[PDB]
Design a protein around this nucleic acid. Structure first.
Lengths: 129, 80, 123, 150, 80, 205
RNA sequence: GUAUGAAGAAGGCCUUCGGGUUGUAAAGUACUUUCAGCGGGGAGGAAGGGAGUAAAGUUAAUACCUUUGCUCAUUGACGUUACCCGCAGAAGAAGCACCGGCUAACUCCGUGCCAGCAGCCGCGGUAAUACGGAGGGUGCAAGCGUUAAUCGGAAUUACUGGGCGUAAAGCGCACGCAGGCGGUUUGUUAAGUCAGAUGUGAAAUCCCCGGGCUCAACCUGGGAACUGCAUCUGAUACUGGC
RNA sequence: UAGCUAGUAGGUGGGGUAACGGCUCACCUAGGCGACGAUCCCUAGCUGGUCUGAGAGGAUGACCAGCCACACUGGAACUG
């Protein structure tokens, strides 16, 4: 049956940027707007904006580079059948610094770069390059 | 601090003891897969406010008889 | 594959196993020999091969090749056998050797003298 | 600068309805010396002519590759059907290593600092285009600088 | 008893010593409680060829541990 | 064990001089009059890549006269200290006492220099040394032993060494038969006409 | 042992015989003796203890015992030690397997589907340089080959890093117990999680960086790791519990 | 190798012992165990390590250290 709210968001991004879509939309949540604010300033999306307040929605403007998507791989890894936790140096190196790992933390959603700079760790959300 | 566990009664067929099941509920160290891993203990209780299916809290203490070292503290769910 | 079963029964693969198990982890062994004979080769090789039948103390009975030119062997003659396959023989994965017991000296050679031990001249 | 290389020569000896073959097939690489790489293949009766049949298309075949400071800095995979390639950065004073195809494709890219391995079919005419597929998969910190933000 | 002794190392002709706190029971080369340093009878061209924590020796004397005559000569070899 | 193979035939075989029977003459050289190819060059086959490695491996070992397992020990010692296996391997062979005696000019051939080590005619730090595999230490003094300091063949090797360029990493006095080994061999004066891009493919695996 | 020693000797092997190769090798000459053999001299492992001397030793200053030192008689299985000297004199000291492809070294003769080799290739039915030998050569060398066991090649047991339409295999279908997964928002406890910190993680061994007899073997200082486990004090997103 | 045990599961009391405890005798209640493999068999001492691989891993734990079991078979008690 319907199993995961984040696969329903990542498929719209991944398949929408493969199908040259301008901006893609899904149901909102606290987590979904937290990762949008990372993916924005790390340059993986061109804009994010919410719509509504009762049954709320989120719209992401996709970002392109040289006639393809700005993203080369966005991978889950941390999934309902296997969650991944990473400590302050135990954090992996995504594509030798050409990509990021996204961490939830007790202190705010951030990159593994910002987590190393804070001596911090937590649960993984995704790996992006 | 002392070691304490939450588990459930699986047999109450004897008077002053209860058979209690406890779990590990953790990932396997070379597969990442969750493993429940149940273990049984023969826990002391002469109070008899609990029985089979009750969720129970137990503490580590001294041996009382052959292979028996754990004892009852409280009923956790209090279903009856 | 179901990982919730790999945590109870892992992946398993075929293990390696000896072509000379009758020696039981020894580099050579003794046999009394019950028969010494010859047999026709495998494939069109047209070269008659020399062989003997050996029963071992551990319950195995096998066939061995008689390497080195010239021999004196019979039933109850007592011999040493080792590993090494012959491809042009039926079921012969064993070599008979002559550094010990009563087997006769090998035919002499001017090269490769380690082969069945070509013995030096002595006065 | 000269960078161009010969990967393999293969002698054709079979018999056909036109008679018995005495020919050679060659595989070569060239590039532009500024950021592009490519390969060429060809059969002829003489090896210098097979090399030229290959070289003339190897001088036309091009793909642009992101080659930051003439070095590999990230782990990269390449694929073509049955043939796979994997390349990683080496240490100080270490480099290639690996099959003669990868050894040539990296010289037309100006690179040495690679730990290379091949998987599956070691077929030369596939592993060359699988290595070039692995260079389509090569990234640069200078391009990521133009992706970051906004 | 618990004693401060030289453990035999360095193999043949050029021995080398590890100065240890150990129990004199049973095995010659038995388990050892603590190491306090090393001693070399051979010239090493270094002014730390032999190293000892004389305050840690005084702390083990503060445990009532026994002293061996060869270690009293080692305390003399670091010029006390 | 000793190789005992030919001195100059191998120099010609790889087209590259080994400093064997060739270091001191230009006329009356006895070098088989620099052998023209005759009917041999027309009948020489191409070497395999496995053989091109072995030709290099043997050449680089035999020019210094060293043992295989010691040459391989230097291939493990060249891998550390950011030394490069293609760079410090040469300096490890060049830094042996049996080559320091040669570069100090005491023998007109490496075998005539190794003679002085093997006959205990050399001393380092004033101590007699018989080990040809010895790695000489920086700022240490090498000298001819008292019982060997009158050899006219050594005075005559020095009579010729006064006409040669010295390594920058050492010095020697032709009177005293003595020299300081200043540094380990350095890439600022160490060079060889060998395939430095090929010696890296050795022992792998 | 090191150097020098010829259209290139005696002896061999290839060779219509041009030359090649053994070979600067030998003979000749120069030149230096390590190791060895024998004779000579002969360390270190023999310190620790003991005797005298000295100490307001501590005690009750010359019982034991302790003391930075000084001075002496002493202790050797290894042992004909190590090391050096002396004496001739290059003198006494070298094999093993392989050389047509993968596989570096090259030919020539013998064997003749017989014998004998092999991992694959297959060889050999009288040009197999694939079996035996010789000359030259290759490689390794007090070793070299052969056999046994078990590994590295091996991404062919699978996370690193696969397969199931046709090339291994999706169960004939549905149902379903036991087991696993599961939308959102505000709290709560703080197990899991993350942070900080301490203990535990023996020596040897390894790695990384050094030191010791003339080197290495051998011996040994430093740095690192032992992913975790145990416990303490914080963080609080998400899961678990509520 | 699919059924195992019933001195076994839980409990109480005496007796002994350095502490604890079925260690042991007697009795009361009626269980306990197995699916995460009990029962059965084969192989094997275990570990620091040894050797090997870039590593995950693989083989192997002589000699040397850190523990164990044993010394013709079996039972037993005493001495320190």
């Amino acid at each position: 049956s319907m199993q995961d709210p984040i696969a329903d968001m990542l498929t719209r991004i991944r398949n929408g940027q493969a199908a040259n879509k301008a901006a893609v939309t899904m149901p909102s949540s606290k987590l979904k707007v937290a990762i949008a604010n990372v993916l924005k300033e790390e340059g993986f999306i061109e804009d994010f904006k919410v719509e509504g307040d009762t049954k709320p929605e989120l719209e992401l403007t996709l970002k392109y580079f040289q006639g393809k998507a700005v993203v080369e791989s966005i991978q889950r890894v941390s999934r309902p059948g296997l969650r991944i936790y990473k400590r302050k140096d135990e954090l992996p190196k995504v594509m030798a610094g050409l990509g990021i790992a996204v961490v939830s933390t007790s202190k705010g959603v951030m990159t593994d770069r910002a987590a190393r700079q804070a001596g911090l760790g937590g649960e993984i959300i995704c790996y992006v390059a | 601090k002392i070691r304490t566990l939450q588990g459930r009664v699986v047999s109450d067929k004897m008077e002053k003891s209860i058979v209690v099941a406890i779990e590990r509920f953790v990932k396997h160290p070379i597969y990442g897969k969750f493993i429940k891993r149940t273990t049984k203990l023969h826990v002391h209780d002469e109070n008899n406010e609990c029985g089979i299916g009750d969720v129970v809290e137990i503490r580590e203490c001294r041996p009382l008889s052959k292979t028996k070292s754990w004892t009852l503290v409280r009923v956790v769910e209090k279903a009856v | 594959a179901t990982v919730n079963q790999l945590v109870r029964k892992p992946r398993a693969r075929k293990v390696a196993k000896s072509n000379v198990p009758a020696l039981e982890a020894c580099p050579q062994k003794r046999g009394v020999c019950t028969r010494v004979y010859t047999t026709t080769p495998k494939k069109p090789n047209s070269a008659l091969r020399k062989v003997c039948r050996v029963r071992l103390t551990n319950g195995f009975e096998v066939t061995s090749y008689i390497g080195g030119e010239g021999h004196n062997l019979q039933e109850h003659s007592v011999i040493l056998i080792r590993g090494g396959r012959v491809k042009d023989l039926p079921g012969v994965r064993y070599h008979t050797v002559r550094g010990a017991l009563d087997c006769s000296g090998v035919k002499d050679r001017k090269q490769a003298r380690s082969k069945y031990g070509v013995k030096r001249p002595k006065a | 600068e000269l960078q161009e290389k010969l990967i393999a020569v293969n002698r054709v000896s079979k018999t056909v309805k036109g008679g018995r073959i005495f020919s050679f097939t060659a595989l070569t690489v060239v590039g532009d010396g500024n950021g592009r790489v490519g390969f060429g293949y060809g059969k002829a009766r003489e090896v210098p002519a097979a090399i030229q049949k290959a070289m003339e298309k190897a001088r036309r075949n091009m793909i642009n590759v992101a080659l930051n400071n003439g070095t590999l800095q990230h782990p990269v995979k390449g694929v073509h059907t049955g043939s796979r390639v994997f390349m990683q950065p080496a240490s100080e004073g270490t480099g290639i290593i690996a099959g003669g195809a990868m050894r040539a494709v990296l010289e037309v890219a100006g690179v040495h600092n690679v730990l290379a391995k091949a998987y599956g079919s070691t077929n030369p005419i596939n592993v060359v285009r699988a290595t070039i597929d692995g260079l389509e998969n090569m990234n640069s910190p200078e391009m990521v600088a133009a992706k970051r933000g906004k | 008893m618990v004693t401060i002794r030289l453990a035999r190392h360095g193999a043949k002709k050029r021995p080398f010593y590890q100065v240890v706190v150990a129990d004199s029971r049973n095995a010659r080369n038995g388990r050892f409680i603590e190491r306090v340093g090393f001693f070399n009878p051979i010239a090493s061209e270094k002014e730390e060829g032999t190293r000892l924590d004389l305050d840690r020796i005084a702390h083990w004397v503060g445990q009532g541990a026994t002293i061996s005559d060869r270690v009293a000569a080692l305390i003399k070899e670091v010029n006390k | 064990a000793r190789y005992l193979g030919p001195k100059l035939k191998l120099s010609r075989r790889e087209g590259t001089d080994l400093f064997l029977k060739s270091g001191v003459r230009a006329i009356d050289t006895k070098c088989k009059i620099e052998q023209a190819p005759g009917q041999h060059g027309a009948r020489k086959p191409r070497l395999s890549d496995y053989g091109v490695q072995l030709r290099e491996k043997q050449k680089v070992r035999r020019i210094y006269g060293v043992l295989e397992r010691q040459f391989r020990n230097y291939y493990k010692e060249a891998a550390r200290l950011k030394g490069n296996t293609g760079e410090n391997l040469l300096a490890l062979l060049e830094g042996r006492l049996d080559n320091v005696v040669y570069r100090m000019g005491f023998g007109a051939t490496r075998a005539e220099a190794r003679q002085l080590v093997s006959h205990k005619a050399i001393m380092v730090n004033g101590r007699v040394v018989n080990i040809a595999s010895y790695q000489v230490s920086p700022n240490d003094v090498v000298s001819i032993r008292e019982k060997a300091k009158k050899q006219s063949r050594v005075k005559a090797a020095l009579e010729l060494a006064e006409q040669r360029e010295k390594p920058t990493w050492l010095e020697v006095d032709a009177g005293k038969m003595e020299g300081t080994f200043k540094r380990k061999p350095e890439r600022s004066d160490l060079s060889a006409d060998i395939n430095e891009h090929l010696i890296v493919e050795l022992y792998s695996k």
